[PDB]
């Protein structure tokens, strides 16, 4: 299963918004307690190192909608080269095609953005692709296939959106590019790459 | 003409057999795993062509040649004085 049905259940327990900030943005008296009958008081009485390593892992990967072996493969790929392991890892986790679509703001949610990629509504480098696990390099153009523009949602998405500094796009022409490699501080700070990278004694 | 030869100084045991003598060589090699330096011995056969009578305790050399017989495969080429 590449899709997880429930999304707010992750934001509650993990204490981190899967979206930008709208996971617990006062939606129906939004809470922060862990899901289930036992959310009364279990704050911290056995919080161990392995627990926080798992927690950081889950905050990092389900936010991108990735599975375990796929992300292990991503680690094996990023270990091939030489450089700062954490920054390179997070750059790889940022180079995914569906992630770039959200950075373009073509979809309200990353979950929605991943769906356009599968159906072929996203065209990359003049050759259409339908795989969300593409690794992109700087200077790659992205277009909306010049087809299926008349989505009542894509217009509501590309109209208003926060474009990060490390990428640039044109709203009207539906054309963008991957300008440069993002910096750690330019992304949400609730992800400590060190714990995830040092928990991998697997390889 | 890439013919070869093995410089193996040996210790002839005896010429007891008919016009044939046994040469003993103490090769030094390195132990395969424990890295120590040890020596092993193996008997070599040769035939006394007639010019010399290699008695007990002489030290000689060994050269390759055709198989003159079963288990007798090397002959004398160069000889150094007795002991």
């Amino acid at each position: 299963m590449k899709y997880t049905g429930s999304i707010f259940k992750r934001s509650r327990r993990l204490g981190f918004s899967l979206l930008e900030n709208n996971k617990e943005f006062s939606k129906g008296k939004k809470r922060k307690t862990i899901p289930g009958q036992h959310g009364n008081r279990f704050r911290s009485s056995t919080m161990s190192g392995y627990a926080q390593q798992l927690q950081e892992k889950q905050r990092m990967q389900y936010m991108y909608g990735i599975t375990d072996k796929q992300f292990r493969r991503l680690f094996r790929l990023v270990l091939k080269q030489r450089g700062n392991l954490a920054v390179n890892l997070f750059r790889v986790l940022e180079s995914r095609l569906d992630n770039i679509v959200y950075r373009m703001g073509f979809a309200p949610t990353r979950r929605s953005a991943r769906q356009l990629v599968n159906h072929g509504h996203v065209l990359l480098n003049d050759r259409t692709v339908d795989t969300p696990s593409i690794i992109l390099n700087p200077g790659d153009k992205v277009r909306l296939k010049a087809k299926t523009i008349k989505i009542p949602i894509v217009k509501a998405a590309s109209e208003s959106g926060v474009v990060s500094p490390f990428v640039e796009t044109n709203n009207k022409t539906f054309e963008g590019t991957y300008v440069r490699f993002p910096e750690r501080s330019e992304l949400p700070a609730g992800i400590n790459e060190s714990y995830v990278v040092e928990w991998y004694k697997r390889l | 003409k890439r013919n070869q030869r093995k410089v193996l100084i040996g210790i002839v045991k005896s010429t007891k057999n008919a016009k044939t003598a046994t040469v003993q060589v103490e090769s030094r090699f390195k132990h395969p795993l424990y890295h120590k330096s040890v020596v092993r011995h193996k008997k070599y056969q040769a035939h006394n062509e007639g010019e010399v009578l290699a008695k007990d305790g002489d030290k000689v050399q060994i050269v390759e040649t055709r198989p003159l017989s079963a288990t007798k495969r090397f002959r004398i080429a160069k000889i150094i004085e007795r002991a």
């Binding site: 190192g49 030489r82 450089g83 700062n84 392991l85 060190s194 990278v197 040092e198 004694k201 | -």
Partner: protein
Amino acid sequence: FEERIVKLKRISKTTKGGRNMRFSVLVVVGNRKGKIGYGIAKALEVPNAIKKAIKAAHNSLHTIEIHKGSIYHEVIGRSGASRVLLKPAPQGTGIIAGGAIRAIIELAGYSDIYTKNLGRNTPINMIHATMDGILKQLSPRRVAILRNKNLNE
């Protein structure tokens, strides 16, 4: 100053008519810049024991020196038949060690390191051995001073 505990132990001495349950705790104190100390104390309750251990550790502190965030020469810690090894890891590998070893090295403001547990695994002996191995580190500038080859030799 993170004061991350390592192993609390439930100890008790017998007495006529009852068992004097007075458990003890162990703490590690480090300023993440070179200050390191440890302290073991006992009390009847968790907070009292924790406070006593922190006071004992912070009262007796001792310094360590950092070169590129790592040990620079391999050293083995011989103490109480429980050996701990340190090695000069290259800059990319990051922190890898056991429980108590990771606690000590992380609170020492350190970085990348290579360790391997030897002998027993009782936390107090591991702490003693690791501290001994890290303080017998003889600085390159020190041997430069005590030799005639001070000029980068």
